């Protein structure tokens, strides 16, 4: 509370090297820090200045932080000071903290800067006892003993770290090695081109991955599972397979650590060498370095960083001598303090596990999705697929919905795990109007060759709804022998979903299986957490948004009135009202009455008089019948009219079918399989007599991510779980964060 950190100040601190977000968990932990009463402290420089002191620990205001979400890198200032991983140095960054009076410590940094903090919190009962022989009258030791408190905030484009979701800047790290391979990827186009990338990630294979599932990698080298056995051949044999299969070019990622099964590296040129003496394709090695940490934060790492920083903080002021070192970080989407050392003597344990040639060990203490991403990324790379009996269960798949980023690398995914159980895949064009107007195709590998990255819908999507044609389509699923359902779409997905039970009533045929792959840009579908094609849109309002803080104004001060899309849900104007620091981002599910509206402007101004020269409010497209953008928009010109000017945009839905940033291809592929998978089963499970029944509510669902896990949940129990006026669902995580996007701005 307001009351909480008073009497009490604390210092922040970005060690490690620069990972695009930690300037926003800097800004979060400082804005945050301020609001509790307490005091923050900044560090420059980072662990040093620690050490050294005086003139590198400033005191940070509020004005200080402002424009710093969309600037990467540390502006704090990050250094590499050894002198701290000695004691003869240590005790002096101590002094200069008990010196400053200063009892809570937020580290934003990585494993090892992470791991110094650690060691910190541990060595520092005797530093005072030590730094007493001389160091200050002891009449503070005294006032201020078993009381420092130290939280671990994780920034690092490895992703290493072991215990959080995420760490900060790997997103956008993901961007720039994407943005490059959309670019090698989309050219080559001459001779049979073999690029040889070599991604980051000293022990961890995880980016390296990652880019190889978004970008179809040929093959890919990643630590925690070295290519045990004669492989060159295995490459060569599949790079020439690949080759006369018909195929331009062909993108081996390498991770950095890249190493076989004794521990010789493998190395990037060495590879090239390889093909080239082997095969003789003009190959070409590529590495990328220390640009993948830079570029601009992606909407998700600001927004990470926020909610991290805002976790740290709250960590630092809820501490007390008998709780334990801090690391705050995500998991199954939401905030957690972890202990420190437990996530530091585990992260390390990876590192033994894997300098011994046990890496079963290695990828397993990684594991969960690590593994499976390297499980379906095999698999979707592979060149084959197996040869099609007759006694094969078929499914289609299809769009439906408006279209999302994401929707050809979820059918993609469908169509190539489906060939590979052996199963017969057909495919849908446009939606419902598909197996009703019998536009319907046999899927093989290649269709979906390369989709992976590309926006938009190739299938075709409409929204019309299955009833009323159940006539038409059960006469379709029969004649090309349907026996499943898989459907990529948004509401009208989930929405015609369960317009599908009902026919079960009504018609035998429609008594198949279903799994609505939740794809929407406006992230409004019941059961789960996020949709396809979310991040993709709100990266591009951030973007945008950030673009139009600027305007070739005649004058300084200027207040800007934006408003975004998604219906009725307020997901992207709440996200990208945080992800920009809007100082108002105006949504449905949160009502306002002019009675606030006012407060909201008798605010700006009362900013847009002093500090902030630019001003940001962000408006849901539907947050409100009467008060609408215009209203907004004349209201806070009026109320301004002197102190600042003021422009208003419309967003609108710019041509959402551009291209999938990597979350989204990568969460559509997960998916695609997941759901495959999982309706193979069911369709085994309702096979009878030489006919398939489904007529249970398991066999019709939509798979989503809820908390730390995918889930199938079906259509029906969702139900009472969803708005149908506003077609959104009741109870949106999100809503969650509305008041930190709220104490950012400086309220209440
Ligand atoms: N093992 C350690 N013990 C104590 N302090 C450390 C340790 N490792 C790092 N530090 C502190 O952090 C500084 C920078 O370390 P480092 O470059 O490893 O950052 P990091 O958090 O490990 O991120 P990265 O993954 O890039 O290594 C060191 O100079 C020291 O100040
Ligand atoms: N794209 C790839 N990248 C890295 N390793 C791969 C890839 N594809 C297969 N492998 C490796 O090859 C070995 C398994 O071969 P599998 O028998 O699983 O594929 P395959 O059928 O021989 O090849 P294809 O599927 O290209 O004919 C394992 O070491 C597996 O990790
Ligand atoms: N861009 C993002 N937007 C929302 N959540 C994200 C994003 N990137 C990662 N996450 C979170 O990271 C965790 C999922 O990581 P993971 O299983 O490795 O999937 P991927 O392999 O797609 O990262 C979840 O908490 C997920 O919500």
């Known amino acids: 509370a307001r009351t909480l950190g008073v009497g009490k100040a604390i210092a922040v601190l ?96 990585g494993d090892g800067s992470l791991t110094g903090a650690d060691t910190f919190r541990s060595e520092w009962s005797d530093l005072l006892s030590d730094l007493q022989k001389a160091g200050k009258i002891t009449a503070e030791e005294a006032t201020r003993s078993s009381y420092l408190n130290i939280v671990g905030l994780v920034g690092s484009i490895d992703n290493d770290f072991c215990g959080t979701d995420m760490t900060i800047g790997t997103d956008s790290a993901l961007h720039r090695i994407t943005e490059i391979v959309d670019a090698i990827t989309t050219t080559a186009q001459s001779h049979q081109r073999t690029f040889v990338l070599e991604v980051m990630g000293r022990h961890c294979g995880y980016l390296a991955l990652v880019t190889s599932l978004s970008c179809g990698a040929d093959w890919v080298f990643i630590p925690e599972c070295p290519p045990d056995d004669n492989w060159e051949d295995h490459l060569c044999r ?71 920083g805002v976790e740290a903080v709250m960590a630092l002021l809820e501490g007390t001598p008998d709780t334990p070192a801090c690391v705050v970080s995500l ?38 999705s690590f593994m499976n991403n390297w499980e379906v990324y095999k698999l979707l790379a592979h060149i084959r697929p197996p040869a099609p009996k007759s006694g094969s269960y078929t499914v289609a798949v299809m769009n439906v919905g408006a279209p999302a980023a994401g929707m050809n690398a979820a059918v993609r995914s469908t169509v190539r795990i489906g060939l590979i159980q052996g199963n017969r895949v057909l495919v849908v064009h446009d939606g419902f109007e598909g197996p009703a107007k019998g536009q319907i195709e046999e899927a093989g590998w290649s269709y979906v060759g390369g989709w992976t990255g590309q926006g938009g819908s190739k299938l075709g999507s409409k929204r019309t709804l299955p009833k009323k044609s159940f006539e038409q389509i059960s006469a379709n699923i029969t004649k090309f022998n349907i026996q499943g359902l898989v459907i990529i779409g948004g509401f009208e997905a989930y929405t015609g979903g369960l317009e599908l039970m009902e026919g079960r009533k009504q018609f035998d045929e429609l008594c198949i299986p279903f799994v609505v792959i939740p794809a929407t840009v406006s992230n409004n579908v019941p059961g789960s957490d996020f949709s396809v094609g979310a991040d993709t849109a709100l990266n591009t309002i951030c973007t945008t948004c950030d673009r139009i803080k600027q305007s070739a104004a005649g004058t300084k001060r200027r207040v800007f009135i934006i408003e975004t899309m998604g219906g009725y849900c307020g997901y992207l104007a709440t996200m990208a009202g945080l992800a920009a620091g809007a100082d108002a981002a105006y949504i449905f599910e949160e009502p306002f009455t002019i009675r606030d509206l006012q407060a909201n402007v008798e605010h700006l101004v009362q900013k847009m008089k002093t500090t902030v020269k630019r001003g940001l409010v962000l408006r849901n497209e539907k947050c409100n019948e009467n008060y609408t953008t215009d209203f907004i928009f004349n ?53 009878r007599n030489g006919r398939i029944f489904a007529n249970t509510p398991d066999s019709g669902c939509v798979l989503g991510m809820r908390k730390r896990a995918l889930v199938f949940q079906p259509v029906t129990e969702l139900q009472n779980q969803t708005d149908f006026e506003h077609r959104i669902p009741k109870e949106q995580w999100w809503l969650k964060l509305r008041p930190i996007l709220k104490i950012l701005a400086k309220y209440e």
Request: glycine share 12%; net charge positive; proline share 2%.
């Open 635 to 687: 209201l806070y010109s009026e109320e301004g009219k002197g102190i600042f000017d003021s422009r208003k945009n419309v967003l609108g839905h710019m041509q959402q079918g551009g291209s999938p940033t990597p979350f989204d291809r990568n969460f559509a592929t997960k998916m695609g399989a997941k759901a495959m998978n999982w309706m193979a089963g069911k369709i085994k499970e309702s096979y």
């Open 14 to 109: 970005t060690s490690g090297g620069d990972a695009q977000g930690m300037n926003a968990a800097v800004r979060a932990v400082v804005r945050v820090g301020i609001f509790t009463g307490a005091r923050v402290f900044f560090v420059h420089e980072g662990y040093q200045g620690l050490v050294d002191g005086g003139d590198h620990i400033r005191e940070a205001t509020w004005e200080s932080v402002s424009m710093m979400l969309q600037l990467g890198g540390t502006v704090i200032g990050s250094a590499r000071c050894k002198d701290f991983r000695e004691r003869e140095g240590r005790l002096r960054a101590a002094h200069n903290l008990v010196k400053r009076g200063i009892t809570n410590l937020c580290v934003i940094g």
């Open 238 to 308: 599949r790079l020439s397979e690949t080759r006369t299969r018909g195929s331009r070019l062909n993108i081996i990622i390498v991770a950095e650590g890249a190493i076989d099964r004794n521990g010789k590296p493998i190395t990037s040129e060495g590879v090239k060498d390889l093909v080239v003496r082997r095969l003789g394709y003009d190959t070409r090695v590529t590495v990328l370095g220390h640009v993948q940490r830079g570029g601009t934060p992606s909407a998700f790492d600001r927004i990470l960083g926020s909610r991290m």
């Open 331 to 368: 998991s199954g989407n939401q905030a957690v303090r972890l202990p420190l050392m437990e996530c530091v003597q585990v992260t390390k344990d990876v590192t033994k596990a894997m300098d011994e040639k046990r890496f079963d060990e290695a990828m397993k203490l990684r594991g969960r």
